[PDB]
Amino acid sequence: LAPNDPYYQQYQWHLHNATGGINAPSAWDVSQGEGVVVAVLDTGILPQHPDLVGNLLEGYDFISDAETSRRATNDRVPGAQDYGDWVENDNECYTGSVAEDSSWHGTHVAGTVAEQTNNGVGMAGVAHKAKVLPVRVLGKCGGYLSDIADAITWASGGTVAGVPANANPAEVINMSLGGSGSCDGTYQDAINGAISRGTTVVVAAGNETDNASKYRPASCDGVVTVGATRITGGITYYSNYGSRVDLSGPGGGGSVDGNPGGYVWQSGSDAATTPESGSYSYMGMGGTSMASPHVAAVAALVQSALIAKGKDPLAPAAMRTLLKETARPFPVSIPTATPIGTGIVDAKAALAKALE
């Protein structure tokens, strides 16, 4: 499939480039992810973005701190509106932290997953007939372990006190987020609950040019930990690495690969602070955060194809083996000290194996 989105051809190398893209044109002839729900645990969402609306469920805001969520209370509320995660001053988040504009990070991630495609508007997405369930866990200066833990439980269909039952349990969870420290008992239990409910959990390896075993949920047992590659198919300068990384996806090499080839492109805003301070747009970003949703969306394409054929969806362990086993080996040498999994996720190879 060669869709008509205006900026797809020139910008979206991560979809279609022969050496760094995930072979989406060919996968899209088999599956677009219809019927599957991907939960995006992130900064929240711009719910009326015109290239997203239509593929979004209402979702939920798990941030239990008014100063972080920028809401009027510490409650968790229905809906996932991103209020903006800008930080006005250096050092507000921690000693050494730097002021920055709002990221609209979860709208970017959600676009990778399911940006409306072949609609004559903007950019494309991978699982463009799936639904995104947006679950806001990150705000000003980030988020809290126990909000992220609970969001996992709820997104995968488990019960969380104070939150109404999730009417749309997710086949896949994406976590384009992490922190310092190897996996703790709280994260692992939450992850374990999600797996026991049939949910595949896909996470970003992290961007510290460091061993993924030192970060979470990168280092947690049972998840699909995703490294970052360049348009060239080589490791990015920032990708974490190590035996915990299962495979990679396009993260964008950064300025070394220029504009547009250094960046992943999707739905966003140019707003600096609140949503109202700017307008809907398309942004280019780099990180393992951008690689992870490509993998999470491929998992969605596969569950959807299996169901469409009346076959049984894969359990989490099977899904992870499949993604790993069908990854395209790197077109450029990966340094021995920094392994980033079996290869670059290949949506078409993943589909061909699953379907027989």
Indicate the annotated binding residues. Answer: 5, 51, 116, 119, 121, 123
Nearest approach, Cβ of residue 120 and Ca ion (Å): 7
Rounded to whole angstroms, the Cα distance separating 248 from 75 reads 36
- Map residue 14 onto helix, strand or coil: helix
Residue 105 bears catalytic tag = yes
Q: Of the residues 289, 292, 294, 346, which is catalytic?
A: 289
Q: Of the residues 61, 69, 103, 105, which is catalytic?
A: 105
* Nearer Cβ to Ca ion (51/150): 51
CA-wise closest residue to 313 among 347, 354, 356: 354
Please give the residues from 110 up to 129 whose contact with Ca ion meets the rule CB under 5 A: 116, 119, 121-122
Rounded to whole angstroms, the Cα distance separating 312 from 297 reads 18
The overall longest dimension of the chain from CA atoms, in Å, is 55
Rounded to whole angstroms, the Cα distance separating 190 from 59 reads 18
* Nearer Cβ to Ca ion (120/310): 120
Residue 294 bears catalytic tag = no
- Map residue 188 onto helix, strand or coil: helix
* Nearer Cβ to Ca ion (103/116): 116
Rounded to whole angstroms, the Cα distance separating 21 from 18 reads 6
Instruction: Note whether 5 binds Ca ion by CB under 5 A.
Output: yes
Using CB under 5 A, which of the segments 46-54, 167-175, 225-233, 332-340 binds Ca ion?
46-54
CA-wise closest residue to 54 among 114, 120, 3, 124: 114
Nearest approach, Cβ of residue 121 and Ca ion (Å): 5
Pairing relation of β-strands 224-229 and 247-250? Answer: parallel
Rounded to whole angstroms, the Cα distance separating 131 from 115 reads 10
Residue 42 bears catalytic tag = yes
Nearest approach, Cβ of residue 10 and Ca ion (Å): 14
* Nearer Cβ to Ca ion (116/303): 116
Instruction: Note whether 150 binds Ca ion by CB under 5 A.
Output: no
* Nearer Cβ to Ca ion (285/344): 285
Nearest approach, Cβ of residue 16 and Ca ion (Å): 14
- Enumerate the known binding-site residues for Ca(2+): 5, 51, 116, 119, 121, 123
Please give the residues from 47 up to 66 whose contact with Ca ion meets the rule CB under 5 A: 51
Number of residues that bind Ca ion (CB under 5 A): 6
Residue with tokens 């300068």: 237
Beta strands in 108-199 (DSSP E): 131-136, 172-175, 179-180
Nearest approach, Cβ of residue 116 and Ca ion (Å): 5
The two three-digit tokens of residue 316, written as one number: 């989490």
Task: Point out which residues bind Ca ion (CB under 5 A).
Answer: 5, 51, 116, 119, 121-122
Active site residues: 42, 105, 289
